[model samples]
Target: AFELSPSDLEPLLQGACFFGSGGGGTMISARHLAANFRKGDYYPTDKVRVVDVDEATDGDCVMVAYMGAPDAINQVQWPNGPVEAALAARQRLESQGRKLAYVVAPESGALGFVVASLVAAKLGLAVVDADGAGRAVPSLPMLTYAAAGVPPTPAFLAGESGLCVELGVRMPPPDREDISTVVEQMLRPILTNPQFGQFGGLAMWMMSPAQLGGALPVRGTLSRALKLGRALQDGKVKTAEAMLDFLRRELDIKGKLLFGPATLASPGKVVLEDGERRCTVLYQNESLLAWDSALSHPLATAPDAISYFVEGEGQHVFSNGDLSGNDHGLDPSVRGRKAAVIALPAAAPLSEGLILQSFADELAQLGYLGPYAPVD
Candidate 1:
């Protein structure tokens, strides 16, 4: 574990937001938490610390996150939401006498890192360097823990608005349970609960640090995000030429990112309004893949990379849920507009076989017909 200088904070936030793919917590909240860190002593010490999986103890570690819908998140702001959510879960475990050592992100996203840092800073616990999914995913079953046999339950899910639920595995562990069903069960409450209304923050999963090596993959996702964020900040993303070089190194997927001045108007893409809230997006680019909602199934599972061309920001990376009416904040059509789409490469962690276990067959439905492998 190492202490992070306040200087390292910006790049980390940029990196986390760059790949949030719309589903992570909103930037408004992230900025709120980031501001809290402005005062060095706002935390337990002079500097915030981020600890890697290797540096963690076998002691109990609980993951924290907001469980709101990407679309309606704008209305519900969290107050140290991630931090409070973590504390709520820790409270349950503490009742069982399981002292907490660290807090982890269930997945990687703007909210994932922001909350982990916020929670860790407030509770005086070290923030785990790794996250379950290297990128933001839409649902629970896609988590690295479930892939590695970790139960996605037995913890507290809370919203500061008095929205709280005791989330746990409701049915017996199925010998070969369907993941879609598992995720559906997880979503049932978030979508239907009156307290959640349209949506709210959520935190779950109290785990063991020992689960890091295998069950929980991506040993250094936090470091990777930090690097990616810095790459963008160093003017590496100023143009396609420079971004290609940056992505090749940062994503470690040489020749995988596409060419041309990319945008939502790029060739072979369809952006259309699906209904009242959702929009349908399809990217035919070799590097990007998908149809229906950006999260349904795509060339890249785990929602590893979602990019958007913003008017003033140039090409910004985002989550599918961010714009899919889960938020749909971006323009639906960019024809003759100044918008662009970034062909973000699949994150190394999400592209691996283990993380693809829940994604394989669905990718087939997404029309992926390349050399692919699924976890056995």
Candidate 2:
């Protein structure tokens, strides 16, 4: 267990962005959360407590995250959205005789992790190091919790102001495969309200420590990201090779450079060559696929993270939002600058069972017709 200090914020955000792949929340919101932390606005303690999943008490725990389009999430500057959502959800659970003791991140991302931690600290609950998805996924069904059969009921969504909504499937329709979709459909109108700007905080999936053991398959992701970010900070790794070498040796995350010292030739397109071996990377909010002349199929696909190791102070990782100039108001400034593209396979559990299939549906909408190809 540890408390998040000012020094840990940047590294945590950097690592979280790397795992975000392309579509987690933006660095802008992440920075905003960090700044608020520095100002001691979220909680009086000024320190967010985090505990390993096993360290949490046997009392009920809730999964919490910001729900909405990542780009529009920060338009409202509402710090208490998640806090209020969590408190409201806790109250509802307490009314049913459950005691909420910890807050869990639904996915791994800068804003997701920070928001969950803030909510936990504000409510005097500990933040669990485990999360539903090891990386930021586009939808709720991709969560390990869903794959593991955890129920997503008695969910709560809190708007920027005092608006709070609770939802539950009193009797799930037999035709529905995942009730989360029903919950999502029911909440979309509220989230997309003109006043809310498509942003709000969500709290759901209440479970006990024993249930959490299976529900949260991606354990220690927060600490894993932090350790990865700390290595970048301590080593000051500049070149892609150096970073990859460290990752392979120290962290066992074998990564390969897909593009080197490259520039974005155009939006969603980057062309590169390595001695007659040409490769093109397609991306919008996050990298989608990489096609190389050497292969008949895509070199890499979604869920296989294609990350940017941009040239900057400490060579921090940049989400596609920063590279592509997203709705989050990040400008596309890496146009002619040197940035290395590194590819790594999705964490093992994320590719197993229904989680992988659920992600495939979203990827299909992105126009990739092939199955997920693990990066070599």
Candidate 3:
């Protein structure tokens, strides 16, 4: 149980938000969560305890997070959203004779860290220093558990509406055919669940240190996020360009940072109409792919990264949700913004198969058919 000071909380929040790749919930939400964990409140303790993944075993951890449209989050409406939802879910599990151990975040994001931190801190539980996804991703199964074949279910959900939603996944039989097939049939649907409404907090049961460590793939992600945020706070590099240079030089990032002005970007959003692919995919923001303006190849694509960032002092950075939207706006992401496309291939958890290849044609039709070229 290592304690984190109040000052340490800010960078962790910022780091989580930046890694969200444009879709994690906002910093405002994180700030709210952080405030709740301060001194002399529900928790008289001033510092929050965080556990190293090494200290947490399979039987001792469970993951929690708020699920919804990152951009549509109204912080004030549900100030205690994650804490309340986690409490509801945790209580339900406790009723089942399950021991509530550590609280873990599903992926990298403000909600992932901030929410989980509050959940753990309030409940006197420790936060495991690892994330399900090294970076924020769209669906839950993209988590390390599913990638490592852990059961994606036996889950619980709660929302501000006060409904306690119990959910579980249908696992493969003892004589199950192929593991990969099980993932497609079982995991994917759970991730794409449309019935869960738009916003809610989810708690999942996961216990497997061996698979988790390997599947987790990116180790020390939480600590690294804090370090980067600390650097950004230290005031050496104020511009996004300098930040990028610092990242390339200091962090263990697997790709070079490049730009894809919304001015010259094409999405190939994976919208499904009737099973057959189409070229009219709109950009709602997961930044799946980005091609160079002059080069015939993609600057970065899915399985890699394409985070967004603003261009000046303080250089506001965005994960997908805050930066881009669909045609609902007037090509909303045009001229002024810059897409900080990146290619962290080694850090990508989708290595079993590139999920983006499914929409290869859509990307090509949108002019991103060639090989990826990371900066030198």
Global lDDT of each model?
0.57, 0.74, 0.57
Maximum-TM-score candidate: 2
lDDT (Cα, tens digit) per residue for candidate 2, span 50-142:
888788875788888887786677564545678878888789779988888899888877777888777776788888997877777767787
- List the candidates ranked by TM-score, beginning with the highest: 2, 1, 3
> Each model's TM-score, in the order given?
0.75, 0.89, 0.74
* Candidate 1 structure quality by residue, lDDT tens digits, 318-358: 44433332213443533323333344545455665555655
Q: Using lDDT as the measure, name the better of candidate 2 and candidate 3.
A: 2
Regions of model 2 farther than 4 Å from truth:
38-42, 76-78, 170-177, 268-286, 312-315, 325-333
Q: Residue 111 lDDT in model 2?
A: 77
**Steric collisions counted per model:** 15, 0, 6
Residue pairs clashing in model 2 are none
Error of 1 at 47 (Å): 3.5
lDDT string for model 3 (321-355, tens) is: 44334554313543344433444553544544433
Best model per lDDT: 2
- Worst lDDT run of 10 residues, candidate 3, spans 270-279
- Using TM-score as the yardstick, the better of models 1 and 2 is 2
> Least accurate stretch of 10 residues (summed lDDT) in model 1?
278-287
Candidate 3: residue 129 Cα off by (Å): 1.6
